[PDB]
From a paper:
Here, by studying CRLs in the SKP1–CUL1–F-box (SCF) family, we show how neddylated SCF ligases and ARIH1 (an RBR-type E3 ligase) co-evolved to ubiquitylate diverse substrates presented on various F-box proteins.
Transfer of the C terminus of ubiquitin from UBE2L3 to the catalytic cysteine (Cyscat) of ARIH1 (in the Rcat domain) is mimicked by simultaneously linking ubiquitin and the catalytic cysteines of UBE2L3 and neddylated SCF-activated ARIH1. c, Post-TS1. To visualize the TS1 reaction (ubiquitin transfer from UBE2L3 to ARIH1), we installed an electrophile between the catalytic cysteine of UBE2L3 and the penultimate glycine of ubiquitin that captures the catalytic cysteine of ARIH1 depending on native reaction requirements. However, the catalytic super-assemblies, which involve UBE2L3, ubiquitin, ARIH1, RBX1, the C-terminal regions of CUL1, and NEDD8, are superimposable for a given transition state for both substrate-bound SCF ligases. A 3.6 Å-resolution reconstruction largely resembles the pre-TS1 intermediate, but also shows the catalytic Rcat domain of ARIH1 and the preceding helix gripping the UBE2L3-linked ubiquitin. The cryo-EM data show that NEDD8 forms part of the E3–E3 platform displaying the UBE2L3~ubiquitin conjugate. Next, the UBE2L3-linked ubiquitin would lure the linker between the IBR and Rcat domains of ARIH1, and promote remodelling of the linker into the Ub-guided helix, which directs the Rcat domain to engage the C-terminal tail of ubiquitin. The Ub-guided helix and Rcat domain of ARIH1, together with ubiquitin, form the ubiquitin transferase module. Upon the TS1 reaction, the C-terminal linkage of ubiquitin with UBE2L3 is severed and transferred to the catalytic cysteine of ARIH1, allowing relocation of the ubiquitin transferase module from the outskirts back towards the Ariadne domain.
Residue numbers in the entry:
A (entry chain C): 260 to 686
B (entry chain H): 98 to 140
C (entry chain H): 280 to 390, 406 to 554
D (entry chain R): 21 to 59, 67 to 108
């Protein structure tokens, strides 16, 4: 019927050019419109629904032409569209079920798939109409902010968290080296799924946290990639949205600079035996807390004091608070049989360097000399005993489970021997 | 938090008999006497 | 006309919402007034000076029953008044407003110059200005909505007009909190910790005006990339500042820092 | 024994101040003042050991010559860099 109606309208427009007088074209077109269409809207609406259930993206163009030829016929089409596309997207990410609630990649990919399909449909069939694009956008907002995954985890602040974690898992430095051309595109898509979420502050909290981690631990894919992501976040939400991130970036840059000047001034100070490297962060920007009441081993004190004196030189009044809980180095272990090389946090260094003198200290004895907290010592010593560096008085006890007391000796296992070199004793 | 609630006239009337039941649990008096006594004491 | 009783576990001058659409201060009865305390709101609303005159009459011809606290006008001659309320059958003396048992029983017988005017003028001026603007918010909402439609049809999408709506909402909130802050800044003897406050609020006032300006004229067209950025940058600032004002007031209450 | 080949440390950097509000703009000291924010902002110190932003205390002294936490006279004692 649609095909024939199109043909008839074409004809009766042509006919006026071979028989009748020109001042009849408009009226004849109007009457043929009111009769061929404009008196069958109901069956059109039902068919439009069925067509959307199927995927015929050509006849839908015909219906757009026809219904648009009359007054305000689109008014029901937009709402019917929005309804159908909402239902389709929601049921689409329903298939994921629980598997999505812990796999960001699959969730974001599913959302992007639905959005791409219907964006592709409403750019050709519907001539990129305004109101139809509006229908797309309303539906996408609806089914991104509330859905099966949001319901299962019991909040509406799970989708922003998942998108933040996807962008994380994307910008890290993995085994494979990502290709800049692909990376830029994938970030550009994450930005779409971003611009639909409606609570854009939880996203900033999570993104700030993850960026802080991967910047501190020197574990990042591409500096230009980080800069580009920050730049488009700023462009989509303004200079006040992304101030903390820009500062959190510029100060890693400045730290890299200042380490070089320390090296230069170091030419006349003879650093005792160690390669020193520091990162000096701001204080309001980064999400880090004070310290855990550490006692600095005597080995590092020389470099500690030299750097603090150097820093106090170049600036007027500024107070470094060292935070040892996240700071790693390297030990050489010129005490065993095979010349290993250990790599652990500063807590491990304090505890190990204690045994440079003896090998018969107890938990209380370790507490006395390093001032560390009780639970922290428990965790650290447990992880050490997990390695074959330190052994209890027992040999086959489940050291991973049997906790110890202040009056419990720790035995330096002299017979330790890993298969390889450069053991990474860390979690 | 500030826990509150919204009621209509019918429910606020039934709450009177509710409070009367609560007090008469321990007073053991006919309902009329309990209502008079409690009403003198500003509920 | 609403018919709902708002039952609560405890009267604490916190705001409640009725479900008929209204939110009021459970203790006093007015709309929710966040920085200012109830008593000063009453004292300022009596002589509010531009909304009602019957309060002048009430103060001029009525007293209040001490027990039940309803306005009472006397047109008798006994002085031995008895409160004819539902359950406030208390009796007292119309003049001394004390209990009548000893009163008249044996022997106990009952028998703004120049500167304040200017201050009141300035403060009431600001308060009434913001009241007028808060009364017209319906027109503001409809205006920006119609403008959203108009800007949208001229080859502009939907998300832009979304940010515009959020900006309007923040603007209305900021005016509604500058209101009661002016009241609070009336009854306040000038000391250091008051110039700080009366200097922050002027800045927030000015920023509010600049934002309410951006909207109306600079909606015009096809300048999205910059106007949108300006408006977003300008309403985050306003929201942060007003939260600073409220925190300052409440901390002052805690530390006993103000003087009236 | 020796077991010290390399060290990489992380240090937070903060102004040398007891408490942080600037008490003029009520911001956080490390952030930007109420003027540099609606768009160098160092910290100035007082001979009574009070600390403020620079642009805040500048305007305050422009109007009145009193340190606005201790109604006393004010003069600069240590700038900030
Ligand atoms: Zn109500
Ligand atoms: Zn109140
Ligand atoms: Zn009474
Ligand atoms: Zn009397
Ligand atoms: Zn400044
Ligand atoms: Zn001072
Ligand atoms: Zn300041």
């Amino acid at each position: 019927y649609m095909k024939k109606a199109e043909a008839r309208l074409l004809e009766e427009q042509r006919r006026v050019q071979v028989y009748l007088h020109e001042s009849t074209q408009d009226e004849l077109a109007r009457k043929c419109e009111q009769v061929l269409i404009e008196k069958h809207l109901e069956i059109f609406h039902t068919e439009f629904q069925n067509l959307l259930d199927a995927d015929k993206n050509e006849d839908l163009g015909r219906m757009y032409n026809l219904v648009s030829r009359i007054q305000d016929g689109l008014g029901e089409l937009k709402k019917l569209l929005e309804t159908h596309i909402h239902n389709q997207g929601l049921a689409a990410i329903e298939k994921c079920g629980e598997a999505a609630l812990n796999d960001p990649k699959m969730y974001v990919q599913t959302v992007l798939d639905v959005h791409k399909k219907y964006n592709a449909l409403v750019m050709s069939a519907f001539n990129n109409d305004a109101g139809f694009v509006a229908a797309l956008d309303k539906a996408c907002g609806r089914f991104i902010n509330n859905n099966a995954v949001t319901k299962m985890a019991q909040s509406s602040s799970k989708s922003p968290e998942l998108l933040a974690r996807y962008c994380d898992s994307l910008l890290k430095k993995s085994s494979k080296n990502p290709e800049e051309a692909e990376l830029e595109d994938t970030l550009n898509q994450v930005m779409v799924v971003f611009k639909y979420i409606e609570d854009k502050d939880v996203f900033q909290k999570f993104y700030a946290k993850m960026l802080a981690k991967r910047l501190v631990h020197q574990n990042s894919a591409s500096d230009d990639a980080e800069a580009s992501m920050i730049s488009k976040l700023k462009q989509a939400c303004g200079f006040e949205y992304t101030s903390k991130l820009q500062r959190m970036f510029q100060d890693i840059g400045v730290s890299k600079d200042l380490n070089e000047q320390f090296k230069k001034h170091l030419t006349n100070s003879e650093p005792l035996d160690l390669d020193f490297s520091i990162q000096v962060l701001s204080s309001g920007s980064w999400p880090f807390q004070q310290s855990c009441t550490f006692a600095l081993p005597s080995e590092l004190e020389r470099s500690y004091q030299r750097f603090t004196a150097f820093y106090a030189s170049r600036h007027s009044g500024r107070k470094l608070t060292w935070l040892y809980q996240l700071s790693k180095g390297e030990l050489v272990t010129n005490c065993f049989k095979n010349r290993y090389t250990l790599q652990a946090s500063t807590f491990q260094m304090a505890i190990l360097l204690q045994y440079n003198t003896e090998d018969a200290y107890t938990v209380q004895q370790l507490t006395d000399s390093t001032q560390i907290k009780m639970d922290i010592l428990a965790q650290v010593l447990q992880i050490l005993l997990k390695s074959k560096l330190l052994v209890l008085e027992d040999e086959n006890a489940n050291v991973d489970e049997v906790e110890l007391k202040p009056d419990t000796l720790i035995k330096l296992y002299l017979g330790y021997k890993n298969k390889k070199l450069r053991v990474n004793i860390n979690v | 938090d500030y826990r509150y609630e919204v009621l209509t006239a019918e429910q606020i009337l039934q709450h009177m008999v509710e409070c009367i039941r609560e007090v008469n649990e321990v007073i053991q008096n006919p309902a009329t006497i309990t209502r008079i006594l409690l009403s003198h004491f500003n509920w | 006309d609403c018919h709902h009783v708002v039952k609560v576990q405890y009267p604490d001058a916190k705001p409640v919402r009725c479900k008929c659409g209204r939110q009021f201060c459970f203790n006093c009865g007015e709309n929710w007034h966040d920085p200012v305390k109830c008593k000063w709101l009453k004292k300022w609303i009596k002589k509010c000076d531009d909304d009602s005159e019957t309060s002048n009459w009430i103060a001029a011809n009525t007293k209040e029953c001490p027990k039940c606290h309803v306005t009472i006008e006397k047109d008798g001659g006994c002085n031995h008044m008895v409160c004819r309320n539902q359950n406030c059958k208390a009796e007292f003396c119309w003049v001394c407003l004390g209990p009548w048992e000893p009163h008249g029983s044996a022997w106990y017988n009952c028998n703004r110059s120049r500167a304040a005017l200017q201050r009141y003028l300035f403060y009431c001026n600001r308060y009434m200005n913001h009241m007028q603007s808060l009364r017209f918010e319906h027109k503001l909402y409809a205006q920006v909505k119609q403008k959203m439609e108009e800007m949208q049809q001229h080859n502009m999408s939907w998300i832009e007009v979304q940010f515009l709506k959020k900006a309007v909402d923040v603007l209305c909130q900021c005016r509604a909190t500058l209101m009661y802050t002016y009241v609070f800044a009336f009854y306040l003897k000038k000391n250091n910790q008051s110039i700080i406050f009366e200097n922050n609020q002027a800045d927030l006032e000015n920023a509010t005006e600049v934002l309410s300006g951006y909207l109306e004229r600079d909606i015009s067209q096809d300048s999205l990339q910059d106007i949108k950025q300006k408006v977003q940058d300008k309403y985050r600032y306003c929201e942060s500042r007003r939260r600073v004002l409220l925190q300052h007031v409440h901390e002052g209450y805690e530390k006993d820092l103000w003087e009236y | 024994r020796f077991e010290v080949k390399k060290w990489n440390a992380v240090a937070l950097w903060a102004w040398d101040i007891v408490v942080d509000n600037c008490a003029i703009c009520r911001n956080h000291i490390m952030d930007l003042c109420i003027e540099c924010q609606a768009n160098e902002c160092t910290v100035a110190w007082g001979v009574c050991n009070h600390a403020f932003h620079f642009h805040c205390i500048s305007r305050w002294l422009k109007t009145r010559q009193v340190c606005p936490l201790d109604n006393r006279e004010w003069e600069f004692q240590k700038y900030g860099h």
